[PDB]
Nucleic acid binder design. Structure first.
Lengths: 70, 204, 50, 120, 86
RNA sequence: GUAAGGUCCGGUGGAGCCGCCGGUAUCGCGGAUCCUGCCGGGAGUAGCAGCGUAGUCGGGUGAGAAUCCCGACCGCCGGAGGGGCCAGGGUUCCACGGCAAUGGUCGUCAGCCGUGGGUUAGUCGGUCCUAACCCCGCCCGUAACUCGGCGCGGGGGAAAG
RNA sequence: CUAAGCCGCCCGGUGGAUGGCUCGGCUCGGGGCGCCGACGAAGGGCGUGGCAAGCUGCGAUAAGCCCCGGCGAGGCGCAGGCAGCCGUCGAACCGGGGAUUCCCGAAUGGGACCUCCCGCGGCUUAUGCCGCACUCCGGGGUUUAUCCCCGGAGGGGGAACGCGGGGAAUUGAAACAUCUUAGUACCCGCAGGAAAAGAAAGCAAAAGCGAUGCCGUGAGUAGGGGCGACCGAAAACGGCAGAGGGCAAACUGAACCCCGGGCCGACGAGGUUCGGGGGAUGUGGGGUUGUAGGGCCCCCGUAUGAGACCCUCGCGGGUGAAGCCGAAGUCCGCUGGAACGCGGCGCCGGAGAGGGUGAUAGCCCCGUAGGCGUAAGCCCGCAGGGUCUCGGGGGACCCUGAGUACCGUCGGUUGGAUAUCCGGCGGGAAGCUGGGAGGCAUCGGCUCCCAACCCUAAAUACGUCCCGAGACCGAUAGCGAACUAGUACCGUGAGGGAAAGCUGAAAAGCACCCCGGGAGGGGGGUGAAAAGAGCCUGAAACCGGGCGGCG
């Protein structure tokens, strides 16, 4: 995902996306040791970095909200 | 260097020389100058005196002698310089030479004067040297050509800096090694009128 | 040995995971330059540090 | 871009450990006379879309497009500059960019056009 | 531990599959810092099932493995199919 | 060339090197029971006995069998060479696939190599208590301390109590 | 046509010398830069890659996440592979600013035979967050228990340098005790980017100088010493750098300081007000010195002026990252696998330093000679707003540091010798009509000075780091480490500590055939050359075969 499209959504949507990506990462990690014919061996890395982006941007949004409120 | 190892001496009894050896396997010898990896017996030391002193009057006399030897036809030719087309020795040029600050103009002037052959000789004799100096940055052993001595710098240094083996020196900063590189006197030199006047004033 | 603390068990686990051979693709990538690592261990000859 | 030291050890160390943004500049090649007259510039870094003519080596006089650029190895791949394997397969010969001259430029990049404008 | 951070991956070994088929037990490699209550809550919330029992162990490689036995009203085969284990 | 050595010829080698003048130096080796590395004779020799002298027949596997597998016979231990389980070891445990090296010989075998696995507790043990003893705070001594110490307050201390 | 054996040459094996190379060491005048930590340091443990073991980097967001800027088409570490993915909406990379940052560790709520465990109070619905060590400082409350609460400190680390204390022996004296080694090794405590010292109760006597520190020299001198071995300065003079200030008291007497809030001013400087904590056992004002200075009193004069500093609501300039520009052949013939070589014809040059490129290149590329740009930050200036400072004569009154100076004795230390400095013990003043020093003690003269309170930049010392350089080494050398090196490995433990670089221009890293269980062997291919990965050259010793001679 891209930082612009991540910033386009709100905190609740970011949280739901984070949960979905964590579950999907667990499923891919299971399939990695289950199967052998992996079409895309970069799914795990991409999912991890999207989770990192989502968490970073959500924390940035929280900081901005606190700064605006204060 | 070579003194960081902790050793113990086996001593007599065992059929080995009484040499300091390590206290851990495989117990090599160490710390002694005849052991691999040990200290050197007499290494170079930074406290050694390398500077050499010379009396001021002796240096002045040597400089005067080198200046005199500059104007000798036999010495200049014997050094190796090409003076076939040189009008006379010493070569005196007008003070207008000090204002030339373009290398092409300097090349034309030198061709007219007759030292371009010496510059070509210096370029041809320069080349790659032999030994480990190439590792340390001394790959080329460059030769020396004409030396331009002027009374004032008005751009001649920039004009003639790039010519191979050519040094432009103001008369006030002239030294013995400028006139006799490698302890060999008789370097081809080009003086100016102002430089000659300063030589007359100083007499050395 | 039967009763083990968790920290010591984890350290032994790290050593056990360390003890393995160099990957064949690593050898191919390095062009027969990297063939082994200094952490190879035989349980009966070379003992653990702890 | 700035190697002031005259020590060969430091020059070679800089060349070997140069960052990628410096290896980008370290892959320039001379332009042809026509392109030089047209653009008022002497050389440009080699891109993939460029067409070059090899000036040194076993493939001197051969012209072709660029198919790969390796900044890490300081090498380029030119179509037609190939070796034959024992099994009959084509492989590319890596050529230093200083051994080729660019005869056709790929100018689809605004930043490359900005480079030309800066250097002209 | 917060759920969705507990489970690292499933276990897809022959013993794991036999346990899934026979004893209604799933098996997950989970975070070492997670406890039995954390594992139970994570599985229940994630898979919308009721957990009967949870057993845990620490593998010789340092990972934590959890056997989660589901209640008879819920089938572990369906969860395995959802997760791709089959 | 008295000589320390120099220079040419033939071959290998594939990238640097030398004459002369003047300086400079970790500047010349057969020994130091010298140091480091490599390699000889001893030698295809000793050892592979002593305290528990154990194998044979038929079959199987495999390119290959005294040494691996099954059956029978014959033997050894049998108040331990049997059963259980601490400390210590830390994967040596299990299956499959193997024999370049390891195994005092061989090996298709293995505590060896490779690839996959394996340790599930309200009741078993730690966790609780205190013993000998130890630590921390105050206090005192010391030039001082991470050093020495009585007394007060707190804590720890047993996987066979 | 002699079996073993011996010597010499050739071929092959074993081995790894020599030669050439070098992203690593070593040493330096100069320049730069120098502390981190309870807002949780350094050092460690454990995790983290699709295939991932070591090193490196990161921390459950785990070889990475976000934002402004530079570069401009590739990128995914050491590390030449498979499959994929990221990048034109500007990546990789680079300068700056942010986010995450497990556990142990000063480790800090309480415990550690295992870097793992066990609690109590508030909020929170719950998830979850905060607080709770000890020794103190400034405050509040009460239960007056040093009990609770608010605010703030210290702890630990750092290669060398620094400051303050404790302090040997081997050794030399050709033995050895005073002495030397030596105020050394080492131990303990305390700071910083420097530290310490620093403004005369001094140095000197025809004359005088005028804080401290460092360099040259004084000088192996004065002087100490079984006057044995040895030890050993200062002043003056020539230099680098230069800078001086504040308390206590006399006098006055709350005119005062800190914390928090408000108002004017600009948001700042500055001005003003309220509450709380200090303060008459003295906050603030004033004053800091010798043929005396200051206080107080008296007298004359002055300010109308001059000067210094503070601040930036604003403006201008300079400097300041990544970075950008920056001339000239890749022309003809020859050799060559490949021209940087040879011969011929040209060009630039404020650029002929150095490096790469299939040979040795001023003109192929990077660069160099010379110029340009740069956010934050820093500096200077303009303009405006404020605060503060500034004169001479006389006196008869007052003040100018106490277990201190100093004396005797004892121990240490010193060149300090009846004449160094420090400490213990027993004594112990004057105090402005005063006091100290001038190398044995006292008396007189003369000269210099004012202790017993405090601060102070520059010139200096070092290098865990950086720039730059070299008559240093060139893989048994140079640091121990050119490389997954303080690693592997040894010891219970303090602690000890290796070996190990090189294919080729390009993997073009040998397709296919015969044999072998395999390892491999023979053909056949690639390459200028097998240089064949057991890879540049391949020496000697040693081993096998062939040849010549003896046998």
């Amino acid at each position: 995902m891209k930082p612009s499209e991540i910033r386009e959504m709100s905190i609740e949507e970011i949280d739901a996306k984070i949960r979905e990506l964590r579950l999907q990462l667990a499923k891919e990690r299971g399939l990695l040791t289950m199967g052998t014919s992996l079409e895309n061996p970069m799914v795990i890395r991409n999912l991890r970095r999207d989770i990192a982006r989502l968490l970073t941007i959500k924390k940035e949004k929280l900081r901005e909200r606190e700064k605006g409120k204060v | 260097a070579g003194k960081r190892r902790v050793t113990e001496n086996i001593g007599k009894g065992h059929s080995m020389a009484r040499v300091e050896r390590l206290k851990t396997p495989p117990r090599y010898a160490a710390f002694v100058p005849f052991a691999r990896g040990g200290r050197r017996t007499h290494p170079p030391k930074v406290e050694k005196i390398i500077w050499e002193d010379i009396n001021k009057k002796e240096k002045r006399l040597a400089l005067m002698s080198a200046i005199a030897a500059t104007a000798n036809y036999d010495l200049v030719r014997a050094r190796g310089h090409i003076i076939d087309n040189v009008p006379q020795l010493p070569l005196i040029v007008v003070d207008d030479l000090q204002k030339v600050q373009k290398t092409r103009e300097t090349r034309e002037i030198f061709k007219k004067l007759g030292i371009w052959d010496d510059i070509v000789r210096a370029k041809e004799k320069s080349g790659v040297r032999a030994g480990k100096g190439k590792m340390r940055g001394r790959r080329y052993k460059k030769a020396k050509g004409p030396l331009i001595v002027v009374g004032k710098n008005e751009g001649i240094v920039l004009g003639a800096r790039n010519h191979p083996g050519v040094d432009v020196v103001v008369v006030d900063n002239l030294g013995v090694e400028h006139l006799a590189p490698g302890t060999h006197p008789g370097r081809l030199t080009v003086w100016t009128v102002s430089a000659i006047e300063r030589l007359r004033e100083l007499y050395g | 040995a039967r009763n083990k603390p968790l920290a010591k068990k984890l350290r032994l686990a790290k050593a056990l995971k360390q003890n393995r051979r160099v990957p064949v693709w690593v050898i191919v990538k390095t062009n027969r330059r990297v063939l082994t690592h200094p952490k190879r261990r035989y349980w009966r000859r070379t003992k653990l540090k702890e | 871009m700035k190697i002031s030291s005259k020590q060969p050890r430091k020059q070679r160390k800089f060349l070997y450990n140069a960052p990628l943004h410096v290896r980008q500049k370290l892959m320039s090649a001379p332009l042809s006379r026509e392109l030089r007259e047209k653009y008022k510039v002497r050389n440009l870094p080699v891109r993939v879309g460029d067409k070059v003519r090899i000036m040194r080596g076993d493939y001197k006089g051969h012209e072709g497009k660029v198919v790969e650029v390796d900044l890490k190895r300081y090498r380029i791949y030119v179509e037609g500059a190939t070796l034959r394997k024992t099994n009959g397969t084509e492989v590319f010969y890596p050529i230093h960019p200083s051994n080729v001259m660019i005869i056709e430029l790929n100018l689809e990049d605004e930043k490359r056009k900005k480079i030309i404008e800066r250097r002209a | 531990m917060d759920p969705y951070k507990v489970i690292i991956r499933p276990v897809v070994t022959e013993k794991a599959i036999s346990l899934i088929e026979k004893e209604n037990k799933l098996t997950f490699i989970v975070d070492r810092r997670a406890t039995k209550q954390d594992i139970k809550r994570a599985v229940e919330e994630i898979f919308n099932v009721k957990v009967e029992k949870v057993n845990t162990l620490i593998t010789p490689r340092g990972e934590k493995k959890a056997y989660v036995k589901l209640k008879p009203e819920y089938s572990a085969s369906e969860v395995a199919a959802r997760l791709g284990l089959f």
